[PDB]
Structure 1
C-alpha cells in the first residue's frame, strides 16, 4: 500500500490539453497558425512526498486505464497520448507488491474541434423568433457570415437555432487567383494573401482567423488559456446544444469564386478535394461541404472568366470527386456527411450545368432565388418574386416575347418559379431543391411617379441610382438593405408604411415593395406574405424546404414566415 498519488496541477498544465494548436496573438499563414494532431500529448505530474512511492503507476479516465509506467521517486511525470476529446474523471494509481492506492478523481480536459470538451452554448435569441413544430425532415437553412461579428454585431448565440436544420457558414476562400476580392476593400485581399502564405494554390484557408477562432466571446466563457475561441468555438458549443443541427462550410461566394474557373484541370480539383478532407478532419463540428461557385460558364464577379464548354463538366466532376472523398470520411468516422451547392437560378446560369448529372452525388441544391433585379442598373423589378410581375412585357415571362427595342428576349424572365422549373426540366428531383428566401431588400432612388408607365406600379418606373443610407438603417452597401432595417424604418408596426414610404404587393408575382413617392426610393424584398407563398409553393412541388440569406439581417419575421409557410 504505497502513498496515494497527489496531482501537481501546475505541473500538469491545470489538466488542460488540446488536439489543436491555434495561434491567438499573431496572424500568419494557415498552416503556420493551425496545427491539428490526431493524438493529444498528455503530460500529468504527481507527487508522493510522504511514505512510500511504490513501483508502478496507472492512469484512469472514467475507470478505464489509459496509461502506465514506473515510479522512481517522490515526484513522477506521466506522459502519454490520447485521441478522444472530452471531459474525463482522472484517477492516478500507485502500486507495489503489497497493493495499490488511488488519487481522488479530478477532471481532465482534452479539447477537440467537435466541441466534446465544451458545455452546450447559451443562446441569446431575439424573442420575436417564435417556436414551431416543423417536420425535422424539411430543410430550414440559413447563412451565417464570418464578418457579421463586426459592424453587424451578430454572433453565433444570436441564431434561432431551434428554427434551423442547416447553418451555412460564409465564406471559406480558396488560395490562388482572387482579383474579385479587391472589390471588398477593408484590406480583405491582403488578409487572404497572408492566410495563403505557405499554402498551395487551390487549397482552402480561413479568411479571418480573428473572427474564426481567436476572438474571445464572454457569452461562451472564453479566457486567455481557452484553446479554441471565436465563431468556431461557439459553433462547436452549438453542436453540443443541438446535435442534429447541420453546420456546413460554404466555399466561395460572389467575391471568392475566381479559383473555381481553374477546376477544368483535374489536378487542381485533386488539390482542392484533398484540402477539404484535411479541413473537415481539422474542424470536426462541420458536417460536409457547400460549394458556392458563381458561376460555371461566367457572369460572376470576374468578367474575364467563364468557360461554357468546360465549367459544367468540371462542376459535375468536382461533385463526384467530393462525394468519393466524403465517403472516405464516412468510412473513417461512422458519421454522415452532406454535399451541397448554392447555385444561380437565371436561365443563363442554369443552362451551363447538367444538374441531373451533378445532383446524383449531392444532398441538396440551394437555389438562389433572389437578386433577380437590383441596383447594378436602374431597372426596377422584383428581386425575389415567385412569379412574373405585372411590370413585365407581353411574352417576357416565358421569353417568347419582344423587348422595348423590338429585340427578342433570350430566355425566360428572372423569377423563382422560372428557375425551379428549369432545374426540374433538367431532371433534378424536387426533393433535393431548396427554395431561397431573401432576408434583405435591394433598392433604388429616383423612381419618381413621373417615370412610371403604370401610375400604381413603381416597377414600371426608372431609377436615377442605388438606395443610399446608414448602417443604422441596415444599409451596409448602396442598393442593399437588411429586412430588419426595412421593417424598422420603412414598414413600421403593421405594414402601414412610415417616413414617406408606402407598402405595396404584386399578387401576380407574390412580391412586396416599399416606395417613397417624394424621394423615388424603392425597395424590393421578401415579407411575411411572400414567404408564406414561397412555403406553400415549396410543399405543393415537394421541394426539400427553404433557405435564406443572411440570418443577421432578419428580425425573426422572415424565419417565422418560413416555418408558417411550410406548416
Structure 2
C-alpha cells in the first residue's frame, strides 16, 4: 500500500551500469583509467512523490530479487552490486507492514567486456569484398590497426568479417624503454608516456584509449551514457555477430618492441605475463595473445639492442610461460585461448630462435613474408615475393655467391619461400605456419631507365629516395602506399597502368610492380596474381593458411584473392 516507486532515469545514469569502470573524459595512466570489478556497482534513484513511501524496497531483475534496503522518505537511492553482464527488466517494489507496490519494469543495462549487453554489430562493408565458402579450418587472418579510425577512416564495422577467421588488433604497447616509439615522431611516444604513468615497467597498456573505448561511434548505437564505446565496444558487438571469429591483441610490432629485449630477466617476463592475464580478464572479447617481437637477436628498430645468444631462449621461455598462464584462463572460463606470434623471416632473424621448440607452446606463427626490400635504402627489390626474382645475382638466392664488390652473401636472399623453408628445416610443422600477404606497396623515387642494368626490369635500378605522395593517394608515410591507392592511382580499372605508371610482373619471383619511368617511382606490392601464387604455395605445403597486413589498406581485391588462391591451388 505504499506508492509504487517511479525510477529517475537521469538520476540513475540512464540505467547504464558496467562491470568495467572506464574514464571517458580524460587521458591518464592505464591503472587510473581502467578498473575491472567482479561485481558492477548499481545505483538507482526512485521517487514516491505522492502517498506514503513505506519502509523497505526490493529490486527484481526479470522477476528475481536482487537487492533490498530501507526507504526512509520520498526519494531513495538503491545501491547494490550485481555480477552478471546483460540487459534485464528491472522492477522496484516499495513495502510497508500492509503490502508492497511494484514499479512498472524498465530495462537496465549491465555492460561487460564480452559484449553480453550488446546486439550483433551492424556492418558497413565495401561490397567489392565477395562471399566465399572457404573451409573454416583454413586460417584467413588480418591485422586491424587502432589508429585506422582517424585519417584512414576505417572502423570495425568496415571489416569483411565473414571472410576472416582471425582479427589481430595492432598494437598493444608495453611500458618501459621505448626509444623506438619516440623516434617515430608525432604523438605516439607522448601517448605512451601518459598511459604508463602509475604503471610498472613491462606491463601492457592501451596506447590510445580514445580509439579503444572512449570515441562514440553512431553506427554502433553509442550514446552519451554507453559505458563502453570505441573500437573495443564495436569488437564486442562483432563477437556477438560472429561468435567463432578470434580477435587477438597483438603486443609489440616494429616500433613497440623495445621492452622485449629486457625479457632475458625472468622477473620482467613474470610482470608482463601477469599483466597479460589481467588484460584478458578485463577485456573478455579477446581470445588469446599475439606476440610481435621485432626481433629476437636485434636488427629491428632498436639499433642498440638485440642479443643473439639469449633472446631466442628468452622468447621460448616467454611462450612457455604465456601458455601456462593461458591454460589457467582456459581452466577458469571454459574457453579456448590461442597463443600466436608474428616473426621476421630473413635467415638472420630465423637463426636466432629455435622455433621448433617455441612452437610446441603456440597455435600459429604468422610468418611476416613482406618488407623484404623497401624505402629505408635505395636498393629496389620485391618486398613480398614468393621466390628469388630475376634481378638477383648468381648465388644470391641461396647465399652461395658474392655481391657487386665481391663480398660473399651472408645467407639466403629475403623471399617468402626461403623463410618458410628455413622454418620447416628447423622442424616447425607446416600446419602451424601462416603465410603473410601485403595489402600495401613499398616504393622508391628516382629509379629511372638510365639506372637499370636490365632495361626491362626496374628491380635492377637504383633509387634516389623513398616514394613520396599524399594521403589522398593512400600514402600515409614516405615509402609506403595502401594497395587501394596503388589500384586507384597507378593501376587503374584494367590493371594496365595510369598516371604515367606501367604494370609489370616478375613470373620467376611471383611479384608485381608498377613503375613510372619519368619520375622513377617504383612500387612493389601484392596483387591478385601474386596472392593466388601464395595461396597455391600454402596449399602445396599444407600451411595453416594466409594472413595480411593491414585490412584498412585493401579494397576487397587482396582478401578476395586470398580466398580464391586457397580454393584454386592445384
Q: TM-score range by the shorter chain?
A: over 0.9
Q: Distance in 2 between matches of 1:411 and 1:123?
A: 46
For structure 1, which segment, 465-474 or 12-21, has the greater mean C-alpha deviation from structure 2 after superposition? 12-21
Deviation per CA, 1:105-124, whole angstroms, max 9, x where unpaired? Answer: 22111111222222222211
- Asked if the contact 2:13–2:225 (Cα under 8 Å) also holds between the matched residues in 1, the reply is no
Pair 1:76–1:558, CA change in 2 (3 A): same
Q: Distance in 1 between matches of 2:10 and 2:399?
A: 74
- Asked if the contact 2:375–2:466 (Cα under 8 Å) also holds between the matched residues in 1, the reply is yes
With structure 1 as the length reference, what TM-score do the two structures score? 0.96
Q: Provide the secondary structure at the position in 2 that maps to 1:28.
A: coil
Q: Distance in 1 between matches of 2:519 and 2:50?
A: 86
Q: Distance in 1 between matches of 2:10 and 2:445?
A: 64
Q: Distance in 2 between matches of 1:271 and 1:320?
A: 15
Q: Distance in 2 between matches of 1:195 and 1:10?
A: 32
Q: How does 1:113-512 map to 2 (within 5 A)?
A: 113-512=113-512
Q: Provide the secondary structure at the position in 2 that maps to 1:205.
A: coil
Partner of 1:522: 522
Deviation per CA, 1:463-488, whole angstroms, max 9, x where unpaired? Answer: 12211111111111111111111101
Q: Provide the secondary structure at the position in 1 that maps to 2:140.
A: strand
Deviation per CA, 1:128-174, whole angstroms, max 9, x where unpaired? Answer: 11111111111111111111112211111111111111111111111
Q: Distance in 1 between matches of 2:60 and 2:114?
A: 23
How big is the shift at 1:62? 2.2
- Asked if the contact 2:146–2:169 (Cα under 8 Å) also holds between the matched residues in 1, the reply is yes
Q: Distance in 2 between matches of 1:49 and 1:317?
A: 65
Q: Distance in 1 between matches of 2:153 and 2:14?
A: 34
Q: Provide the secondary structure at the position in 2 that maps to 1:256.
A: coil
Deviation per CA, 1:507-565, whole angstroms, max 9, x where unpaired? Answer: 11111111112222111100000001111111111111111111111111101101111
With structure 2 as the length reference, what TM-score do the two structures score? 0.96
Deviation per CA, 1:247-267, whole angstroms, max 9, x where unpaired? Answer: 111111111100000000000
Q: Distance in 2 between matches of 1:62 and 1:563?
A: 45
Pair 1:428–1:57, CA change in 2 (3 A): same
Q: Distance in 1 between matches of 2:304 and 2:9?
A: 60
Q: Distance in 1 between matches of 2:238 and 2:498?
A: 38
Q: Provide the secondary structure at the position in 2 that maps to 1:107.
A: strand
Partner of 1:39: 39
Deviation per CA, 1:63-111, whole angstroms, max 9, x where unpaired? Answer: 3332234555655443221111111112334556766554332211111
Q: Distance in 2 between matches of 1:543 and 1:96?
A: 70
Deviation per CA, 1:349-382, whole angstroms, max 9, x where unpaired? Answer: 0110011111111111110000111111111111
Q: Distance in 2 between matches of 1:71 and 1:518?
A: 83
Please provide the CA RMSD for this pair.
1.8
Q: Distance in 1 between matches of 2:288 and 2:103?
A: 42
- Asked if the contact 2:252–2:292 (Cα under 8 Å) also holds between the matched residues in 1, the reply is yes
How big is the shift at 1:285? 1.4
Q: Distance in 2 between matches of 1:84 and 1:365?
A: 35
How big is the shift at 1:431? 1.0
Q: Distance in 1 between matches of 2:139 and 2:175?
A: 31
Q: Provide the secondary structure at the position in 1 that maps to 2:281.
A: helix
Q: Provide the secondary structure at the position in 2 that maps to 1:199.
A: coil
How big is the shift at 1:406? 2.3
Q: Distance in 2 between matches of 1:154 and 1:463?
A: 32
For structure 1, which segment, 348-357 or 232-241, has the greater mean C-alpha deviation from structure 2 after superposition? 232-241
For structure 1, which segment, 38-47 or 456-465, has the greater mean C-alpha deviation from structure 2 after superposition? 38-47
- Asked if the contact 2:14–2:225 (Cα under 8 Å) also holds between the matched residues in 1, the reply is no
Q: Distance in 2 between matches of 1:422 and 1:29?
A: 42
Deviation per CA, 1:287-319, whole angstroms, max 9, x where unpaired? Answer: 111111010000010111000110000001001
Q: How does 1:546-561 map to 2 (within 5 A)?
A: 546-561=546-561
- Asked if the contact 2:445–2:466 (Cα under 8 Å) also holds between the matched residues in 1, the reply is yes
Gaps of 5+ in 2: none
Deviation per CA, 1:34-77, whole angstroms, max 9, x where unpaired? Answer: 12211101123344556666665433222333223455565544
Deviation per CA, 1:231-290, whole angstroms, max 9, x where unpaired? Answer: 112212212222111111111111110000000000000110111111111111111111
Q: Distance in 2 between matches of 1:214 and 1:12?
A: 20
Q: Provide the secondary structure at the position in 1 that maps to 2:303.
A: coil
Pair 1:377–1:13, CA change in 2 (3 A): closer
Q: Distance in 2 between matches of 1:55 and 1:331?
A: 45
Gaps of 5+ in 1: none
Q: Distance in 1 between matches of 2:45 and 2:465?
A: 69
For structure 1, which segment, 315-324 or 157-166, has the greater mean C-alpha deviation from structure 2 after superposition? 157-166
Aligned pair count reads 567
Pair 1:110–1:439, CA change in 2 (3 A): same
Q: Provide the secondary structure at the position in 2 that maps to 1:174.
A: coil
How big is the shift at 1:495? 1.0
Q: Provide the secondary structure at the position in 2 that maps to 1:443.
A: strand
